[PDB]
Each structure stands twice: as structure tokens, then as C-alpha cells.
Design a protein around this ligand. Sequence first.
Ligand code: 4KT
Length: 282
Amino acid sequence: EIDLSALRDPAGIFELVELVGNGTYGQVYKGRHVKTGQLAAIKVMDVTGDEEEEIKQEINMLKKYSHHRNIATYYGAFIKKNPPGMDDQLWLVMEFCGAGSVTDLIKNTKGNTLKEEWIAYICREILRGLSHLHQHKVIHRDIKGQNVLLTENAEVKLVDFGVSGTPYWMAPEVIACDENPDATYDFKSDLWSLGITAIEMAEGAPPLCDMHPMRALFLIPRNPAPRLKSKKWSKKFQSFIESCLVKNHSQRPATEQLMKHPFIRDQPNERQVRIQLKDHID
Ligand SMILES: COc1ccc(C#N)cc1-c1ccnc(Nc2ccc(N3CCOCC3)c(OC)c2)c1
């Protein structure tokens, strides 16, 4: 576990190149290891006695649970010191995924939809990542297109442990309403989220996206489980979506049995799929 008080200043070690996006309670940069030139992603967060133990918790998980092919690797943590009583900046440093997010991948594909074969490759990788986290009793809580990232070799990596606002990817049991007073996250909630991003990949957007976040939030527990509207998709894919999106979380498959669903396991043309992906990156 990491001591915030023991973190060095990032000066001369890493440097920021350009803004890349946003994360939970911080901005995200394409960064660079100054001495070697190697690229890295750097999440920068203001830090306060308030935010610290949540910040500290995000760091510890990235450091502890990123030794796995499908989780963006921890590089380090730094504190850019700054006169009291003011905010210091914390730099959380991880491997750089040059291809960007799956959400970016969708935006630059024809029709904002992806081949089922691509979706299956990506879903397996996320699931595999989730399994590793769930094994260590970690819930991701923020599984969505933007948090699913790709390296220039089309390897899939999960990022942003800051939650471990936007309602669209939230499972029914997570939404505190009249019938569910003490809404809490469990591992299965990640699996609902995965089903939503699968739809996101196939259709460019999550269900209920045309509606206001507050009305989406209200509808998700009541409405029946979302489905693919086109039926051009295989019955293995539609069945996979129905497995992820079981409303009653207790009746929803565990991660390990979802890993054994045919859509996930029955993948020929696999190193072929990544090659296409790798090529589609440029
Ligand atoms: C959204 O990403 C994150 C969110 C939260 C946290 C945390 N904690 C970490 C990351 C992260 C982690 C590793 N690599 C990247 N790289 C990367 C991400 C996005 C892009 N974009 C930029 C513009 O739109 C097109 C592509 C990109 O361009 C080359 C590179 C990002």
C-alpha cells in the first residue's frame, strides 16, 4: 500500500505532452518519461485532506491489481509539491494506450457500429479483466466504452479505478429508488455495464441515450431489459446480451459463467481479428 507522504515530485521524471481526455476527479494526459522518451498516460488530480483517502485508494488498486494483460499497467505515483495551505497535484502514471478508447473506435467506423467478430474479441478481453478484479474482490463500477482502451497492437485494457453522474451504464440494483432504498454495487453490476457497452459497440450509443440522464435513471429499474433492435446479429450475440442484462442481479450470471457463454468462447479468426483491429487503428 502506498504512502502519499513518500511520493517524489514528478519533475525530471515524467512530463505532460497534451490533454487526452478526462477521468474520475481529474484530467488525463498523454505524458512522457523524460529521460527515455517512452509515452505514458498521466491522470492529474488536485489533492486535499478531503479527497486524499479516496485518491489514495485509487492509487493502491492500480498499483496492486494491474499485473494482468487486460488492465493498463501501473507505472508510478508522484506529488507535485505546492505552498500551503494550497492544493498539491497528484500524478498517477500508467501505460499509454495509443489507439484510444472503444468509444473513439466507434466514432470512426462506418455507421458507428462494429462487426460482431470485433465486439466478441473486445467483450472477452473486458470480461477477462473483470474476472481478475472480481477475484481480488474489486468492483470496477465504471465499465463503459470510454474506459475500455486499446494499445497500438489492439490489446484491450481497462482504466480508471477512481470510482472503484452519467446513468446510462448503471445496473438496476445500483439505482436507489423506492423499492431499492440501499442501492449498492456488487460484482454483477459490472456485468450489466458490459452488456450495455456491448450494445454501445453494436449501435453507437447505450439504450436510453436520447433521454435526459435523470429520466434514464428513473426508467432503468422499471423498463424491461434492453435488446439489440436489429436482428442482423447472430443468436449467440443476442443471447449474450440477454445474459448480461438480467434485471434481477441474483438471477444474473456470475463473471465466470459469462466467460463460458458461447459468444465469448466460440471465437475463431482471433489473431485475425486483432490484425484487422491493429490495421484499423491507423
Ligand atoms: C480516456 O482514457 C483514460 C481515462 C482515464 C484514465 C485513468 N485513471 C486513463 C485513461 C488512459 C489510459 C491509457 N492510455 C490512454 N490513451 C489515450 C486515450 C484517448 C485518446 N484519444 C484522444 C482524442 O480522442 C481520440 C483518442 C488517445 O489518443 C492517442 C490516447 C488513456
